Structures are given as structure tokens and as C-alpha cells.
Amino acid sequence: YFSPVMVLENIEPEIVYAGYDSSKPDTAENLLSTLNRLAGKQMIQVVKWAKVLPGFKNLPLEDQITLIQYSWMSLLSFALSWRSYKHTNSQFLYFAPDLVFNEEKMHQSAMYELCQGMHQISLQFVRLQLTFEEYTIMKVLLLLSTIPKDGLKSQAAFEEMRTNYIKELRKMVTKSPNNSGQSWQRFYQLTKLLDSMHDLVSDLLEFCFYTFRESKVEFPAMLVEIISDQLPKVESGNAKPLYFHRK
Amino acid sequence: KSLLQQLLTE
Ligand SMILES: CC(C)C[C@H]1COc2cc(F)ccc2N1C(=O)c1ccc2c(c1)NC(=O)CO2
């Protein structure tokens, strides 16, 4: 089918600024509009990254679009967890170099409990001492974690890609079991962490869909397009989360 | 043609 992990390390998008205006009042509307502005800019980076992701080009365009639309919140939240871990040892939420949340901003954003949920994932990165190689493979698995209930246009091509990235994660933990002791132990800690993202992302999307439909919260064109397509699919039960270990 | 379609096909 295929060093694909060395490709993943080299194609990871560069950090982007939020464009946070600290002279404007820190109302929830201003903070959430800033997060949406940042999410839109990051989504352009995600599409460019996915285009050069080994294997992704094999999937038909309709399936590439479906996967990006269903996984956007997972990809962005997992990368937020990574930056928080790398840059602050998971003490703060590192949205961008110019936007680092403390308790004050978590309250001001009107997303305090969701920010605490996010902080709990970054704390798991510290507990596991997650490596960049592990992070990059796991982020590809998140792009491949949510599909239509009735499947994709090219379901077998998708399954081949996801199976091969799972094999890469198993090989990575076989070469490096890290602080978990044995290779199998590491593997199940990583798959348990990947599965835990579905519940956090479901909660993040519920609030995002609420502000999108009831809105001074501004959304960039990139998010208006993704959310307008995704929202009816998620709410009608068409988005099937793939779990390694069923609840 | 959507923004995603534009970006993925360019
Ligand atoms: C901003 C992006 C780098 C990180 C991503 C993923 O992780 C998040 C974790 C959080 F704690 C808060 C926000 C996000 N992110 C969102 O895009 C986001 C999430 C829910 C939302 C909105 C935006 N916008 C709303 O208007 C309200 O609902």
C-alpha cells in the first residue's frame, strides 16, 4: 500500500495566528468570532495537508469532502491539545501564539465547561508523554473516524487507507512502547484516547451548531460552508463515529 | 462549486 510517518512529520501545517484584537472588549461574541476566524484559517491548512496525505488522493472527491466535513472539529481539537501540550505542558489552551486561554478567557468565551473538557485531553498527552510521531498518525486516524451511516462512495478504498494507518500506529508502538511499558499496552492507551475524542467533539459541535443557528457570533465562509452541510447530517443521525472499542 | 471542492481540485 505504501516511510509514511516521516512524510506526516514533514507535511504538518505551520502554526497560524488568530488575529486576536486585545484592544476590543473580551465579550463572548468577540472571543467566539476570533476562534471561528482561526478555525476557518486552520481548515484551509487542513485541506492542503489532506491533499498531500499518503493515500488520500485515491479516495473519490465526494468522499474526501465528506471526511473533511465530518472530522473538522476532531482535527482542530486534537491539534489544539497538541499545541497546549507542546508549548505550555498542558497548563493553558494554546489556540495560537497570540491567543492562549487562562481561566479568565475560558469563562469569557461562554465555553468554560467545554474548555475544561479540552484541557482534560491535553492532560492525557502529558500523562502518556505523547510523541510527535504518534500524534501525526493519530490525527490521520481522526480524519478517518466519522463516515456516513450508509457508508462512503468507495467504502473499500477508505477501509484500506484506515487499516494501513492503524498498522502504522501498531508498528510505531512496537518500535517505541514509550512510558506505557509493553507495545500492546501503549497501543490500547492510544486507541482509548482516540475513541474519547468522539464524545468531546460531539459536545463541541452541539455548541457550535447552537451559535451558528441562533446567531453577534461571526463565522468565516469556510465554516459557513462546512457547517451548513454537516449540521443537517449530524442532527439527522447520518454521521457514524468509528470506534476502536465499542462503548 | 464549493470552497472545499475548489481547494481539493486546484
Ligand atoms: C478554534 C480552533 C483552533 C479549535 C476548535 C476545536 O477545539 C476547540 C476547543 C475549544 F475549547 C473551543 C473551540 C474549539 N474549536 C472550534 O473551532 C470551536 C468549537 C466550538 C465552537 C466554536 C468553535 N465556535 C462557536 O461559535 C461556538 O462553538
Concatenated DSSP letters for A13-43? PPP------TTS---HHHHHHHHHHHHHHHH
Q: Which three cell numbers stand for residue A210?
A: 447552537
Q: What is the CA radius of gyration of chain A?
A: 18
Q: Which helix (H) or strand (E) holds B3?
A: helix B3-9
Is A225 within 8 Å of B5 when comparing Cβ atoms? no
The three cell numbers of residue A236 are 439527522
Q: How far apart, in whole angstroms, are the C-alpha atoms of residue A160 and residue A166?
A: 10
Amino acid at position A96, single letter:
A
Residues of B in contact with A49 (CB under 8 A): none
Does A189 show up as a binding residue in the annotation?
no
Distance CA A107, CA A126 (A): 24
Q: A101: phi > 0 → left, psi -120 to 50 → alpha, else beta; which?
A: beta
Work out the minimum CA distance from B2 to partner chain A, whole angstroms: 8
Interface test with B, best of A47, A56, A143, A226 (most B CBs within 10 A): A47
Q: How many CB atoms lie within 10 A of CB A83?
A: 18
Contacts within 8 Å (CB) and 24+ apart, A222-229:
A222/A40, A222/A43, A222/A44, A222/B3, A223/A36, A223/A39, A223/A40, A223/A43, A225/B2, A225/B3, A225/B4, A226/A43, A226/A68, A226/A69, A226/A72, A226/B4, A229/A69
Placement of cell 441562533 in the chain: A214
Of A44, A51, A225, the CB nearest to B2: A225
Determine, for residues A47 and B4 on separate chains, whether the beta-carbon distance falls below 8 Å. yes
**Domain ranges, residue A50:** 1-247
DSSP A158-172: HHHHHHHHHHHHHHH
Residue A87, SS3 per DSSP: helix
A83/A95 Cα distance (integer angstroms) = 8
| Domain count of the fold of chain A | 1
**CA A115 centroid distance within chain:** 14
Q: Cβ A225–B4 below 8 Å, yes or no?
A: yes
Tell me, what DSSP letter sits at residue A178?
Answer: G
In three-state secondary structure terms, A227 is: helix
CA dist A67 → A16, A71, A136, A212 (Å): 23, 6, 17, 21
Residue A59's domain is classified under what CATH number?
1.10.565.10
d(CA A43, CA A230): 14
CB atoms within 10 A of CB A229: 15
Sign of the CA dihedral running A99, A28, A102, A137? negative
Q: Where are the alpha helices (DSSP H) in chain A?
A: 4-11, 28-51, 61-88, 103-108, 112-128, 132-143, 155-175, 183-214, 221-235
Cα angle for residues A135, A233, A111 (degrees, 5° grid): 60
C-alpha cell at A174: 512496537
> For residue A204, how far is its CA from the centre of ligand 1 (angstroms)?
7
Q: What is the resolution of this structure in A?
A: 1.5
